[PDB]
Design an enzyme around this catalytic site. Structure first.
Site, short mmCIF file in Angstrom:
data_model
loop_
_atom_site.label_atom_id
_atom_site.label_comp_id
_atom_site.label_asym_id
_atom_site.label_seq_id
_atom_site.Cartn_x
_atom_site.Cartn_y
_atom_site.Cartn_z
N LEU A 93 0.85 -1.19 0.00
CA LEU A 93 0.00 0.00 0.00
C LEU A 93 0.88 1.24 0.00
O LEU A 93 1.70 1.43 0.91
CB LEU A 93 -0.93 0.00 1.21
CG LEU A 93 -1.75 -1.27 1.42
CD1 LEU A 93 -2.57 -1.16 2.69
CD2 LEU A 93 -2.64 -1.55 0.22
N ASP A 94 0.71 2.09 -1.01
CA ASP A 94 1.56 3.25 -1.21
C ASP A 94 1.02 4.43 -0.41
O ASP A 94 0.09 4.30 0.39
CB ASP A 94 1.67 3.56 -2.70
CG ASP A 94 2.27 2.42 -3.49
OD1 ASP A 94 3.05 1.64 -2.91
OD2 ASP A 94 1.96 2.30 -4.70
N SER A 95 1.59 5.62 -0.63
CA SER A 95 1.17 6.80 0.11
C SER A 95 -0.30 7.11 -0.14
O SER A 95 -1.04 7.43 0.79
CB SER A 95 2.04 7.99 -0.28
OG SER A 95 1.93 8.28 -1.66
N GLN A 140 -2.25 4.64 1.82
CA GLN A 140 -2.12 4.81 3.27
C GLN A 140 -2.99 5.97 3.76
O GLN A 140 -3.62 5.87 4.82
CB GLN A 140 -0.66 5.05 3.64
CG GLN A 140 -0.37 4.96 5.13
CD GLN A 140 -0.57 6.28 5.86
OE1 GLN A 140 -1.09 7.25 5.30
NE2 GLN A 140 -0.14 6.33 7.12
#
Ligand SMILES: CCCCCCCCCCCCCCCCCC(=O)OC[C@H](COP(=O)(O)OCCN)OC(=O)CCCCCCCCCCCCCCCCC
Ligand SMILES: CCCCCCCCCCCCCCCCCC(=O)OC[C@H](COP(=O)(O)OCCN)OC(=O)CCCCCCCCCCCCCCCCC
Lengths: 173, 64, 156, 459, 171, 547, 88, 17, 128, 90, 17
Positions: free
Chosen positions: G42-44, G47
């Site tokens: 899960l990337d920025s 997130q």
């Protein structure tokens, strides 16, 4: 103070009509008012009837001092302070009371406005004239004196108005 | 009890107290307690005087 | 009990005076600048941007959190005026020049309409009212000596 | 008034000959008893004042100050023994002795039936005042304030001294009662202009009037807690009492002369009031409170109407009680945070629960919370001023609106907010402080029950 | 400054709430949040820094003309109702020592446990600073980082004040 | 007479002694909340006893028990002119606050200052009672300022809050400006006349009285939060809802109107003054409501709803209908007090939240609030046979049926229309709709007093209006003849709001886009009045102070 | 506020369900140590949605920086409790 | 209050005086 | 459609809208470093004393002290021979006074006229 | 140097470091002020007889109003003094 | 103080009395 004499603070006669509730529903005020008569009027009155004797049992009377009259600033030689001392203190008493009697004249006018209902705009006309005459007289007596009011300046106010009228009558003559 | 104790101390006592103040110190002075005079209506009888107000004139008997 | 020179002093007339001056206030000479030299004579205290203390982000942790000030920071000349409750200059969504123009137009129109309204008021399709007894002149405290000039209203 | 003079005097031997550790014990009790006796002067009469001998006389205008004046003295001793404790007995008694003398130099000042006598006793007061500030002042950094006192005597007392003596030769005598019958009109002439200023200028420095007020704020920086309270409680009122006094012989010339003062006075209020906001110093703003307040009194005197003098009498009494309380309230921090910085400490409500109460209770009177005497006077000024000129209402309107600002600014800036983290010495309020403060608000409020006494002889 | 990368994330984080404020309804907002998401995905792969500069500039003026006059705010943050609404109920930890013994004796468990904070405050005092002296840059710290303890059972340097702070809801 | 007199003043003297229990005595700890309330309970009952005599016999006594001062030719005293206004009004304030007092026990349950609050809550009531019964300016003025002090403290109850401190001052600052007109009357009367008690002014009946009334209008403005002096009222909602409800939505801001009623005889005569009053009431009501339609937090809308309603109250004064303006305030007091209490249910339900964008679906989760929020709004909307109708309908007929200004008069029709426009938003956003509240929901109204308090007020919003309108004395003319479209123009135009508002409510769900509208941002930001004034003037005084 | 107290253990299961309500978060890949960037992938962008979901799950706003550093549930658990003064 | 124990300590200035 | 925000004296530019933030260089990384690095020096001094176990009271802050000491500007600044500040600064504060004099002098004399001839109704003009 | 007083004498009051004097000084400070000067001082003003001739002014304001109406006298003539005595110039 | 008259809930509709 004992009580008010009518010639001093005259009051109107009271004409409360006899109640005429034509409905068959009982008036609550009769029952409720009787309660206050039976609960507040009497027991306080019962105490009241007790206090009176104790005030009357040990009695003492305090009097109302009166002040004689002495020559005023019309009869005082220049800078004769001792003779002037009477006039100003005597004058201060004169002014002091006259300030209140303007209230008393205003007391009749003020009260007559309220007790007499919406016809206060018509009923109290006499109180107005009873009141307007003095105020014109009153300001003629103790107005435009400043914080350091004195008889000499109070007198001088008469001197300036008299020569304003005396001359004016001669002018209008 | 709470209602009764507070009643005497804070209701019956001051009301007694107020009565004496007005009944013997405030009223005794002129123009102290004022009351707007009672209204007068036709055909009402007086007690101090015993007089009775006239009724009103003859209404035209409208459709009412 | 701080040394004399560590207190505000006269205007530094030459950069060398600035080089030592900015050291007292601890500020970088690059940003440190005293107020213009004239009869004003504020001294040599920093001429920081005249802005609002609210600008500093609250969530930054300072030694004066609500004041949002760091210990030893060179204070503002109008700091007592720029505090949170006092003068604030937070940006608004709309321009100040436009908002002032927009607000003036709103009011400037509102007043004008009222004058037209007060110059063209409203009245129902009816004439003047009628009161008997010559307008209740005697019932308004009139003069008994003078008879009011009759104002009689006929049937209609 | 010998009955009051001597008992204070013997307090000086009391300090020296009392138990060394009971100097604070005897002084307050012995001094306090005098305060109770102070009331006897209130045997006033409607028309004539109360005149005892050829020297001393008292009346409605001076009566409340006398009763008020002595009241302060025990409080000044109370507020001081914390920091005087640091001083040693050999030099400690030097602090009480001066204060006792100033009581003698004051009570006689308000009862002097001869203006020169008034002037003389009035002049000496600076010596107790100055030595109180100078020798025992927390600051000795050479503020160079000698200019002001140098200026004051040059432009103030000295011309006044000559001014008085000139009158005595002409009229015949300077007894205040005597002028009540021999005062003469003072026509508009060049010479009288200079007499008028000298007869008024000296007090204006002490009211203080606008433009001459530079000296007052700096004093409370130097003067310790004791000196500060009397300065505004008593010393400022001297000018008003004299101005109310000497003005008996300035008619009708005072009319045109008044305007230059009045504009300073009327305008000075808003300028002085708003400056309160920018005062970063607790004691300065507290000082500024007096500056704007007294300006009302001055105008009331210049308009010289029967109503106005009532307000000044009420206003003069009203303010002194408040500010004198305020000095100790703000000073109460100086004995904890060891400075006068307002912004340094905040939120005293949580660390000092009761103390925030006093700030609340005293602040109201400053902003003229009805029916407190403060509004009774301040309002009376508005009534009297408005008659003088209806336009004056606006300045009063704005000034009162401004009054609430600083009236609550410090109450907000100090009684609320987060406790300063690095501050960790905030001790519980002391009994001395709790009781000492209560002595102020109580009589100030209780006067509301019988404000009649403080309505001057006009009432 | 926060570097180029952070600004978009801080703007993207802030952008959604205002959109949610205008749309309000979850399903409606979720719809246009994806449309808003459809924007920053397009410019996710942009590499040329100056190219990335111009694009974010627009998101400022563009956002400045989309911001809601009354966006939703969590009460316990700036702009929220519950900001500085319970500060006074927090109390300094240093006021205890002035407590009259009557108050103090009521809490024997507390103070005995407090002594292990003051003792832990002083016994660890000398060592921790020496940890920082060699761990502090010469001539003055470059950054405001606080190094941790570097031994067995060592308190972090300058720990007392942070740990000894009040609780969000004390009563 | 004597019973009527004594019972007139027993209520006030009843309230004072409880306060003395905070200086002396430590008799009863941990019961002050309930303990204080019961005084208002008994106060209402006893106060009604003179009222019932007042209604039947029309006994308006004047009582001056103690003399407090007399200055030369002017005499002061502690007079009690028991008249129409206070006899009927005081019971309203007593009972309207009765619910608040009992309700406030649970609302402020967690506050350790609950005793202080109960102590201070009564203190405000002390001001109003003497203020309303005040027979003279001086006596009146003391209360006229007393509320402000309590107003500041109760506004800044959370002294930690930054805005609360400013907000209480913000109310103060405008309040100070109010007294300026007040003192002018005090100055004008003493200057021109020679007394301040209300009796003599009505006795002399000034022929030329333009200036003091201007002060009254200005003084009423400050206390009435009118246009020009409005911005402070919204900022006072930072305090507890009982503070907002009791003071800023029931009685406190209506004092300015109250005096104008007290001085009805003078304002009426110079129709120019009547014209002055209408201009403020007309412009204020339109602007106050106009901003409410946009604001998010419910309490903000509630405050402007009172503000818009206040316009009608002043407007009635502008048409020489004193006792009718009295009615609207009392009828308004009946329900507007309930609304904030009901809205408090939302505030407490959502764990101290006011933004309606996280609200919805409380119809089934909180039906009782939906049973109480709805009821009060009906009277506000002008719905027939409700406390609003018994005055709105009767008064609104006078709005267009007397010599008026057309441009100002048009402001009346819009005002009634905008009154109901926001009402559907509150119910739709808060009560109806899908569940927008956060995941952790604490919808549980299991508190007795809340249930009990909501019950009592709900009685007043419905039964009182007919009772009062069928029990008040005749003090004016019944104006019933007028064209039917003019007769119920409120009903004609009130429903129009429903039609457009309901269209908007449907437009809320529709997945169409949002457009920044100049009539929205201007109206959403409150027409720039707060922000521009809260940033222009503060700089000037402080910045220019140094000079 | 009646009495809804919170516990350190209790927040843990709350965190997972918020992590369970994430479609991308496989139930079998959901764990306390599942680093968002690595274990959950899960990337920025992903997130922030969780943190936004968390902010609506606890009624407290997380500042900008405090949402960036949370790249695993444990940090969030180490973070929520510290914020909400949860000790037990 | 609503749970066994969980009684939170009270920190205040020394009010005994 | 989004004009650049037009700031003013009461409403300034945002930091984000400031182009300086979009272009940050090495020398900027020294200006940024100087503020942050310098911010550590005063941080270091203040921090140690605040944490000191045996410190009670307050910690003196010279920068705060400087500003407080900087409000005593009486005689060392400004000089009498000034035409831009002394003369120009004179107008602010003194001008209203002269303005008031004519305002009150004119108004109050006008008040006397009516009394000199009865043009003013003072019927109940008792107090004054 | 700020040697806190509560440390030396925890049962002090704020005056001195001597418990006896602090208590005794406390006693006199509270006693004379609150018990004597304050409470009793309040009473003295309350029963001040005819302060400024307030009581007699009203009582005499009665008779003259009675007498002035009793004989039809104007309640206040426009002449404060007596013009007849006066002898104006010209 | 009745002993947890109503329990809370997690994502569920709160109990109706
Ligand atoms: C003040 C006006 C008096 C001027 C007299 C100056 C000479 C006295 C002086 O200043 O010396 C002070 C003297 C210092 O010595 P010390 O250590 O205090 O002796 C212990 C006493 N228990 O200590 C002293 O106190 C001795 C001086 C006592 C003076 C006051 C004595 C009280 C009774 C007479 C008072 C007269 C007031 C004039
Ligand atoms: C410095 C000297 C100022 C000038 C003093 C002066 O000129 O006095 C003249 C005047 C003489 O007049 P006189 O003796 O009464 O006999 C003739 C009267 N037709 O003297 C008098 O009549 C009485 C003088 C009373 C005392 C004069 C006080 C001197 C100070 C006055 C100036 C004060 C202000 C100076 C500038 C400061 C800013 C205003």
């Amino acid at each position: 103070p004992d009580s008010w004499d009518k010639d001093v603070y005259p009051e109107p006669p009271r004409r409360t009509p006899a109640p005429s509730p034509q409905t068959s529903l009982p008036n609550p005020i009769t029952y409720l008012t009787k309660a206050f008569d039976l609960l507040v009027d009497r027991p306080v009155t019962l105490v009241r009837e007790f206090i009176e004797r104790q005030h009357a049992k040990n009695k003492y009377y305090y009097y109302h001092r009166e002040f004689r009259r002495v020559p005023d600033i019309t009869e005082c030689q220049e800078k004769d302070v001792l003779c002037m001392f009477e006039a100003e203190m005597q004058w201060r008493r004169d002014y002091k009371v006259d300030q209140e009697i303007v209230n008393i004249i205003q007391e009749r006018l003020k009260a007559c406005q309220q007790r007499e209902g919406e016809s206060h705009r018509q009923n109290c006309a006499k109180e107005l004239e009873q009141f307007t005459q003095v105020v014109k007289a009153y300001q003629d007596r103790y107005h435009d004196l400043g914080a350091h009011y004195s008889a000499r300046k109070c007198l001088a106010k008469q001197k300036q108005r008299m020569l304003a009228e005396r001359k004016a009558a001669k002018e209008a003559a | 009890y709470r209602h009764s104790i507070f009643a005497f101390t804070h209701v019956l006592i001051p009301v007694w107290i107020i009565h004496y103040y007005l009944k013997y110190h405030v009223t005794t002075k002129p123009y102290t307690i004022v009351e707007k005079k009672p209204r007068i209506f036709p055909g009402d009888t007086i007690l101090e005087t015993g007089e009775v107000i006239p009724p009103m004139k003859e209404f035209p008997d409208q459709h009412h | 009990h701080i040394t004399k020179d560590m207190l505000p002093g006269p205007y530094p007339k030459t950069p060398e005076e600035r080089a030592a001056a900015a050291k007292k206030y601890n500020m970088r000479v690059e940003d440190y600048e005293p107020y213009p030299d004239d009869g004003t004579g504020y001294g040599d205290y920093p001429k920081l941007p005249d802005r609002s203390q609210q600008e500093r982000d609250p969530w930054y942790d300072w030694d004066h959190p609500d004041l949002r000030l760091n210990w030893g920071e060179p204070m503002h000349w109008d700091l007592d005026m720029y505090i949170r409750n006092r003068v604030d200059t937070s940006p608004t969504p709309v321009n100040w020049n436009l908002m002032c123009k927009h607000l003036f137009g709103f009011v400037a129109f509102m007043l004008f309409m009222f004058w037209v309204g007060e110059t063209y008021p409203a009245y129902q399709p009816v004439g003047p009212k009628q009161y008997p007894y010559n307008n209740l002149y005697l019932e308004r405290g009139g003069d008994p000596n003078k008879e009011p000039e009759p104002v009689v209203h006929y049937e209609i | 008034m010998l009955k009051y003079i001597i008992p204070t005097i013997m307090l000086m031997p009391l300090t020296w000959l009392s138990k060394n550790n009971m100097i604070w014990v005897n002084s307050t009790a012995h001094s306090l008893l005098i305060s109770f006796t102070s009331l006897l002067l209130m045997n006033q009469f409607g028309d004539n004042s109360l005149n005892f001998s050829l020297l001393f006389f008292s009346d409605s205008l001076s009566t409340p100050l006398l009763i008020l004046t002595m009241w302060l003295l025990p409080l000044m001793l109370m507020a001081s023994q914390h920091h005087l404790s640091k001083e040693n007995l050999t030099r400690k008694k030097l602090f009480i002795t001066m204060l006792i003398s100033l009581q003698l130099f004051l009570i006689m000042t308000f009862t002097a039936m001869e203006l020169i006598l008034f002037y003389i006793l009035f002049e000496a007061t600076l010596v107790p005042t100055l030595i109180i500030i100078t020798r025992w002042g927390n600051q000795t950094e050479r503020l160079n304030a000698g200019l002001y006192f140098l200026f004051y005597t040059l432009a103030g007392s000295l011309p006044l001294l000559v001014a008085l003596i000139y009158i005595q030769n002409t009229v015949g005598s300077l007894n205040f009662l005597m002028l009540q019958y021999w005062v003469q009109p003072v026509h508009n002439s060049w010479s009288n202009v200079f007499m008028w200023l000298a007869c008024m200028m000296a007090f204006m420095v002490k009211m203080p009037l606008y433009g001459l007020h530079l000296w007052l704020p700096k004093a409370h920086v130097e003067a310790p807690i004791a000196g500060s309270m009397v300065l505004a409680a008593v010393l400022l009122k001297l000018g008003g009492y004299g101005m109310l006094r000497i003005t008996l012989i300035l008619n009708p010339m005072t009319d045109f002369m008044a305007y230059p003062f009045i504009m300073l006075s009327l305008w000075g209020m808003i300028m002085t009031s708003s400056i309160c906001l920018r005062q970063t110093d607790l004691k300065s703003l507290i000082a500024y409170s007096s500056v704007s307040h007294m300006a009302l009194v001055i105008v009331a005197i210049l308009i010289q109407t029967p109503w106005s003098y009532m307000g000044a009498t009420a206003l003069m009494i009203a303010h002194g009680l408040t500010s004198s309380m305020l000095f100790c309230l703000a000073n109460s921090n100086y004995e904890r945070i060891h400075s006068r910085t307002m912004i340094l400490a905040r939120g005293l409500q949580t660390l000092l629960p009761l103390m925030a109460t006093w700030w609340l209770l005293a602040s109201l009177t400053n902003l003229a919370l009805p029916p407190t005497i403060n509004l009774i006077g301040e309002l009376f000024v508005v009534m009297s001023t408005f008659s003088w000129s209806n336009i004056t209402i606006i300045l009063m309107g704005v000034n009162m609106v401004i009054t609430a600002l600083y009236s609550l600014y410090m109450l907000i800036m100090t009684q609320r907010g987060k406790y300063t983290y690095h501050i960790n010495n905030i001790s519980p309020s002391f009994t001395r402080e709790n009781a000492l403060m209560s002595l102020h608000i109580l009589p100030l409020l209780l006067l509301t029950l019988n404000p009649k006494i403080i309505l001057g002889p006009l009432y | 400054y926060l570097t180029h990368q952070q600004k978009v994330l801080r703007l993207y984080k802030r952008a959604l709430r205002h959109l949610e404020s205008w749309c309000i309804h979850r399903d409606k907002y979720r719809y246009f949040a994806c449309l808003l998401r459809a924007r920053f995905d397009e410019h996710k792969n942009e590499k040329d820094m100056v190219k990335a500069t111009q694009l974010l500039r627009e998101a400022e003026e563009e956002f400045w003309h989309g911001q809601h006059p009354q966006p939703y705010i969590f009460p316990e943050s700036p702009g929220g109702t519950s900001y500085e609404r319970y500060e006074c109920y927090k109390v300094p930890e240093w006021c205890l020592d002035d407590w009259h013994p009557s108050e103090k004796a009521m809490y024997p468990d507390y103070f005995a446990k407090r002594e292990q904070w003051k003792k832990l405050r002083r016994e660890s005092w000398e060592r921790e600073v020496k940890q920082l002296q060699e761990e502090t840059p010469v001539g003055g710290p470059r950054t405001e980082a606080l190094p941790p303890a570097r031994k067995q059972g060592d308190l972090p340097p300058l720990w007392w004040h942070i740990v000894t702070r009040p609780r969000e809801r004390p009563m | 007479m004597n019973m009527f007199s004594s019972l007139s003043l027993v209520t006030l003297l009843l309230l004072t002694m409880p306060i003395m229990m905070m200086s002396f005595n430590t008799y009863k700890p941990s019961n002050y909340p309930l303990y204080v309330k019961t005084a208002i309970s008994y106060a209402f009952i006893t106060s009604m006893i003179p009222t019932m005599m007042f209604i039947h016999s029309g006994q308006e006594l004047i009582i001056s028990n103690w003399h407090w001062l007399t200055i030369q030719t002017l005499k002061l005293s502690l007079s009690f002119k028991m008249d129409y206004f206070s006899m009927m009004f005081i019971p309203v304030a007593l009972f309207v606050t009765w619910s608040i007092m009992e309700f406030s026990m649970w609302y402020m349950y967690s506050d350790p200052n609950i005793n202080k609050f109960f102590k201070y809550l009564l203190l405000f009531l002390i001001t109003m009672l003497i203020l309303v019964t005040a027979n003279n300016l001086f006596q009146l003025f003391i209360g006229w300022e007393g509320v402000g002090i309590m107003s500041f403290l109760l506004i800044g109850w959370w002294y930690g809050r930054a805005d609360a401190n400013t907000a209480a001052l913000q109310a103060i600052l405008y309040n100070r400006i109010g007294d300026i007109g007040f003192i002018l009357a005090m100055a004008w009367f003493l200057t021109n006349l020679n007394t301040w008690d209300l009796q003599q002014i009505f006795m002399l009946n000034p022929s030329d009285s333009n200036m003091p009334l201007i002060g009254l209008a200005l003084a009423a403005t400050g206390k009435s939060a009118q246009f020009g002096l409005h911005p402070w009222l919204p900022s006072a909602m930072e305090g507890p809802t009982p503070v907002s409800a009791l003071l800023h939505s029931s009685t406190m801001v209506v004092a300015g109107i109250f005096l104008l009623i007290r001085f009805y005889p003078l304002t009426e005569n110079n129709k120019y003054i009547q014209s002055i009053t209408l201009c403020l009431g007309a412009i204020t009501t339109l602007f106050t409501a106009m901003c409410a339609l946009t604001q998010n937090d419910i309490k903000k809308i509630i405050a402007f709803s009172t503000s818009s309603q206040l316009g009608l109250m002043m407007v009635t004064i502008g048409i020489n209908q004193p006792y009718l303006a009295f009615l609207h305030i009392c009828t308004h007091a009946f329900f507007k007090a309930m609304l904030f209490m009901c809205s408090g249910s939302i505030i407490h339900s959502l764990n101290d939240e006011q933004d309606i964008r996280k609200m919805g679906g409380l119809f089934k989760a909180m039906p009782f609030t939906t049973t109480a929020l709805i009821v009060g709004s009906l009277a506000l909307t002008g719905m027939p046979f409700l406390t609003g109708f018994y005055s709105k309908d009767l008064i609104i007929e006078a709005a267009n049926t007397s010599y008026t200004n057309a441009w100002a008069l048009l402001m009346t029709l819009i005002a009634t229309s905008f009154t109901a426009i926001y009402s559907t938003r509150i119910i739709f956003f808060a009560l109806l709709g899908q569940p927008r509240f956060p995941t952790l929901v604490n919808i549980n109204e299991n508190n007795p007093l809340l249930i009990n308090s909501i019950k009592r007020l709900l009685i007043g919003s419905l039964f009182a209006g007919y009772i009062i309108s069928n029990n008040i004395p005749p003090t004016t003319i019944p104006q019933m003849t007028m064209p039917y479209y003019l007769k119920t123009t409120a009903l004609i135009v009130t429903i129009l709001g429903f039609i457009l508002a309901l269209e908007i409510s449907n437009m809320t769900k529709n997945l169409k886009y949002h457009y920044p509208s100049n009539a929205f941002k201007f109206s959403t930001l409150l027409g720039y009045f707060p922000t521009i004034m809260h940033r222009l003037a503060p700089y000037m005084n402080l910045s220019m102070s140094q000079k | 506020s009646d009495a809804p107290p919170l516990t350190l253990e209790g927040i843990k299961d709350r965190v997972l369900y918020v992590l369970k309500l994430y479609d991308k978060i496989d139930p079998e890949k959901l764990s306390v140590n599942s680093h968002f960037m690595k274990d959950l992938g899960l990337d920025s962008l992903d997130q922030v949605e969780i943190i936004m979901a968390m902010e609506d799950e606890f009624g407290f706003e997380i500042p900008d920086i405090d949402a960036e550093k949370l790249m695993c549930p444990q940090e969030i658990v180490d973070y929520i409790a510290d914020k909400k003064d949860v000790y037990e | 209050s609503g749970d066994h124990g969980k009684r939170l300590f009270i920190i205040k200035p020394s009010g005994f005086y | 459609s989004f004009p650049k925000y037009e700031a003013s004296r009461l409403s300034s530019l945002p930091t984000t809208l400031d182009p300086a933030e979009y272009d940050i260089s090495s020398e900027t990384r020294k200006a940024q470093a100087e503020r942050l690095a310098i911010r550590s020096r005063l941080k270091r001094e203040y921090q140690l004393q605040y944490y000191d176990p045996s410190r009670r009271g307050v910690i003196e802050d010279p920068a705060l002290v400087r500003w407080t000491y900087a409000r005593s500007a009486n005689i060392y600044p400004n000089f009498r021979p000034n035409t831009k500040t002394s003369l120009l600064g004179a107008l602010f504060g003194i001008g209203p006074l002269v303005f008031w004099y004519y305002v009150f002098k004119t108004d109050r004399d006008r008040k006397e006229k009516l009394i000199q001839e009865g043009k003013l109704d003072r019927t109940f003009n008792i107090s004054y | 140097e700020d040697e806190n007083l509560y440390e030396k004498n925890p049962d002090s009051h704020g005056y001195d470091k001597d418990p006896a004097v602090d208590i005794w000084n406390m006693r006199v400070v509270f006693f004379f002020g609150f018990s004597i000067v304050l409470v009793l001082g309040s009473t003295f003003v309350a029963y001040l007889p005819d302060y400024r001739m307030q009581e007699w002014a009203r009582r005499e304001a009665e008779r003259l109003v009675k007498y002035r109406e009793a004989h039809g006298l104007p309640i206040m003539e426009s002449n404060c003094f007596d013009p007849s005595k006066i002898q104006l110039p010209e | 103080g009745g002993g947890a008259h109503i329990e809370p809930r997690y994502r569920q509709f709160p109990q109706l009395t």
